[PDB]
């Protein structure tokens, strides 16, 4: 995120880091329950990638993080890689996350919910802070 700021540690407990086998962070995701993570289809996740829950400082070795294996990658069949429409993938975890103060689920909306233009929301992540 450009021109954001550092989060209170553990205050976005659904936020996970998707890392490849070399430990490189390449995308974010959100837990929606102990067994499932929602992310973007264009992240190109494979079952050799890892979901990391409970992390704040990716430079720290003292956090009690959970490195969770991915059993299967459900890319929404409606996803269009040419227009990037319907950009959503579900990850089914091999073993459930253990929910704690720093690891828990985000809510999902009803299909009919209205989130109007002008509403302030929040985005989080470990993306670049300067391009």
């Amino acid at each position: 995120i450009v021109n954001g700021e550092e989060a209170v540690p553990g205050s976005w407990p659904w936020q996970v880091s998707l890392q490849d086998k070399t430990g490189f962070h390449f995308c974010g995701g959100s837990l929606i329950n102990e067994n499932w993570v929602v992310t973007a289809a264009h992240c190109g996740v494979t079952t050799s990638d890892v979901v990391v829950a409970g992390e704040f400082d990716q430079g720290s070795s003292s956090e009690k993080i959970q490195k969770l294996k991915i059993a299967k990658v459900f890319k929404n069949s409606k996803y269009n890689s040419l227009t990037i429409n319907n950009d959503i993938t579900l990850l089914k975890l091999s073993t459930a996350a253990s929910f704690s103060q720093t690891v828990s689920a985000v809510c999902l909306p009803s299909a009919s919910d209205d989130f109007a233009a002008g509403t302030t929301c929040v985005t989080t992540g470990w993306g670049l802070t300067r391009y």
Partner: protein, 95 residues
């Protein structure tokens, strides 16, 4: 990428308005947000856009695509979760 998790508040746009920036790239299953002095950027992809309603945070967007230079005066584009949640529900149900 920054070592520590970042956050930013940012407003939702209407699609109509977002099309002033991105034109026909904007589909119904997309929602735009930002153009407010902040921007999602490479490595944020796939994470949450959440809005607080009735005291709880709800996933309204998934970081999807935007300005190649993470321009803070251009809206970012997010997968619109209301358009996708019936699929999520279906998928969890069957697996």
């Amino acid at each position: 990428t920054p070592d520590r998790l970042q956050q930013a508040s940012l407003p939702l746009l209407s699609n109509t308005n977002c099309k002033k920036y991105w034109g026909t790239k904007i589909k119904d299953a997309m929602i735009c947000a930002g153009a407010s002095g902040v921007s999602s950027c490479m490595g944020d992809s796939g994470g949450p856009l959440v809005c607080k309603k009735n005291g709880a945070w709800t996933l309204v967007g998934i970081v999807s695509w935007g300005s190649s230079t993470c321009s803070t005066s251009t809206p970012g584009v997010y997968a619109r979760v209301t358009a996708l949640v019936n699929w999520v529900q279906q998928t969890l149900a069957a697996n």
